[model samples]
Target: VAALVVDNGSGMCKAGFAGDDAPRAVFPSIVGRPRDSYVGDEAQSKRGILTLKYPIEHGIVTNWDDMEKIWHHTFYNELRVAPEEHPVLLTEAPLNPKANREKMTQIMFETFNTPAMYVAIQAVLSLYASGRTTGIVLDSGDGVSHTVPIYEGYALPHAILRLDLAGRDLTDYLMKILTERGYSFTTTEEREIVRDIKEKLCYVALDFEQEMATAASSSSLEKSYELKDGQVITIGNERFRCPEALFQPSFLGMEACGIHETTYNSIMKCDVDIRKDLYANTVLSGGTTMYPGIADRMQKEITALAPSTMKIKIIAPPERKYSVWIGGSILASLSTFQQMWISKQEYDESGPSIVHRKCF
Candidate 1:
């Protein structure tokens, strides 16, 4: 039997058949709705009237209508899969509300008529993607950054630490910096272009102070980028400063622990014996981890915070951007996963609550 795995992330939606190396379709988690009575192409073609809305926010469904449209588009228009024929597996963020999961289960059974479904935590899936059942997973995505401790395949929910700062925060910071420097951008599309610039230009500096010093000293501090519209924009200290927020939230005026400190704190919250394993097998996942020197900077910070007696190691796969989805694909491909699925019949018997029983 084929299983459909979907990682409905804040930045994008990745959906495909299980066992595949990557998703068949990866698109922004957004939908367009017309302002007036027009539907389909005519609706969007009407310039400023059409409004784009996100289905999911912070990795959870915020608008059911938008979410439904996105799902239908993914299944029919993108993957062209018959939902009734395949079991589905979805990844969820840590501490996702029970009501949200139940609503998702209801939609899968009542709307799509899926044969079976399963929900897996993104952090646990990340650990699985790294080929480990136990580790400290530092997942910094577009909307949120979470440090989750996994013990023997199960995530320790109590130790999960979350941060509001992530890729989106960094992008927003860059946008603000550019705006202050006289760059003008208003539409979401323009914001997306700025995000692309952030991805292409920004990097986590190993030494933030030294990098800022060099940037200030050199006349070549500003890197001129020619956008698709032929507008030339210069980026300066925002490159290193933007990503620096990931490790030092104080840069953004948020008095909170950064990914490095959060990871250390998560490990410290666990048993002393397991702390060593968590430290040595630390796995980095999510798109934000792709920034250059992120791993090295995290390694240096984690080492300083960790005990001198313990050996520290961090594993970031080459496909770290899609690691959570890869883990879900691997899990769904396993023969043992069959027992993990919440069958349609079981859902009918036990209601939406069957998800908590079978999948978690």
Candidate 2:
């Protein structure tokens, strides 16, 4: 059977059938209560002011009732797939509460009438997506990051780390500095324009002081961005410094350390035996990791702090933004994976707790 795979994120969500190259339909995690399309106000058209709510916050589902409606829309409207025709694979995050899994299982089996289903922790599936059952996966996207060490497909619980900084923070930081430079983004659309500018212009500087010193007198360092509405803007030092917040969270007024150190710190938490492989195969899965030269910067920073004899490596896959979704896509399709699915019959017989036995 062709299983339906779902990965719901705080910023965006994905849905597709197994054995495919990518998701068929992608939407935002927010939804309208009574009538909506599971995304923003782009097509909310003439609907007489519908109240909106985000089903997920910080990567955890906080509003299951609205989220269920989102899923209903995803099935009947978006993908046009009948729920009873396919099994389901829902990708999850670290520190996801036990009750959430139980509830998800109950909905999949009883409400959706799914033939079978599996809930997979995304970090392990991310490792599996990279063609490894053993390695460390550093996943970061819009809102947060999760770093987990996988040993032959099992994520080490004690060694897992979550960092509260990612692309969204950097975008906000860019808005802050741009506002400081006499530009205001009070209007909601400003966030979209600034976020677009951040993606196009921001990058991690290799050497902070050197980049600053060199840019002071060099006109070449400045770049021009043309606004579609008829204004041309020239950006200067803000380009590198905005993303610098990722390397130095203090710049963004955050108490946490930079991502580079966080990655090394998570690796050291594990047993010394797997340290080498973990370093050699440090996987990066997230939209934030797609920034130009991000891997090399991580490689350089981690090397500076790593043991003299140890080699530190970071792999930023091109399609890393979809790693969580893609991971579930390939996983639920295998002939060998047939027996591992938690069936509706089993759920009817043993109840929702059966997921704890089968999926984990």
Candidate 3:
């Protein structure tokens, strides 16, 4: 039986068989409950009012009902797999609530009757995806951005730093910028379209001060984007300005240090001697990091903040956006990983709380 891997992220969920290069099913982390009743992707596309629900918020499963529907759809409709035949590996955010983990263990064993299951930290899996045993993982996605330091394949809980700013916040920031410029697109469909536009056109600025100077001249920097409805809106430096929030949360009125500062601060929380190794092995992963030149910008800024004598190297793969899922695939396919699974028999004997003891 093939192993199953799933990365339940804030913006999306990636589910597929182990040993694959990428996930077979990648979809929005949302369920569209049709008002008139529909199934599968059709529910999301049906014309009319549909109650859209999200199973996760900030990397936590808030609504198990929607989460159950999502899992059932992924297994039956997407992968067409028999749940009882496969050992499953699921990724959880660092410092996830104990109650949520226990509930997840109970549901998988009771509802799907999973043969075996293991929960792995998404940050550690990302480091594993990069073939590293120690490093600082910077995960900036749709929900909160996380900076976690990993030592010997384990995440240091004390040094984990979470920022309430990320991709969704950037999208919202851009929407406000566009609105002030008289480009009105407020519907749910329109918001997603704009998000795609941000993904396509937005990029991190290497030099924010110089870029702002060049972008201040509206006539010289004007670029028009024609929407599907034939409505054209001119965009200026707001393209890079939107992405600038990652390096400078002050752009969005958030009073907090940027990615570079937070990264340095997180490493400072670790042992003084290992700081150099952590700096040299920094790993960047997540959807927000996909913006063009983001890794480069982060490297430059982070190096500037580090000690002049310290060597700083940032590792970012082209597949960094799916690193967590890829890591899960790599881990679940390992021969040694077989023993890592927590069997239903074990759960039955010790109860759901055994998850905290058996898996980490």
Q: How do the residues 1-360 of candidate 2 rate in per-residue lDDT, one tens digit apiece? A: 589998888778789999997998787666754543434333233234556677777678888887787778778777889888898999878878899999989888778898888999887877888888899998887878888888988888889888888888888899999888888888656787888888898777788888898789797678878899999777888988887888899998889978888888889999999999999999999788777768888899999988989988788888988988888888988889889998888889999988788876
Residue 175 lDDT in candidate 3: 93
**TM-score of model number 2:** 0.95
* Winner on TM-score (1 vs 2): 2
lDDT scores for all predictions? Answer: 0.84, 0.83, 0.86
* Winning model by lDDT: 3
Deviation from native of the Cα of residue 18 in model 2, angstroms: 0.7
- Score every model by TM-score: 0.93, 0.95, 0.95
Q: List the residue pairs that clash in candidate 2.
A: none
Model 2 clash number: 0
lDDT for position 245 in model 3: 90
Error of 3 at 30 (Å): 1.2
lDDT of 3 by residue, 214-288 (tens): 888546656677788897767788888898998889989999999888898999999998898899999998988
Worst 10 residues of 1 by lDDT: 36-45
Over 46-105, each residue of candidate 1 has an lDDT whose tens digit, in order, gives 537767676667766788767767777778888888889999998888988899889899
| Ten contiguous residues minimizing lDDT sum, candidate 2 | 38-47
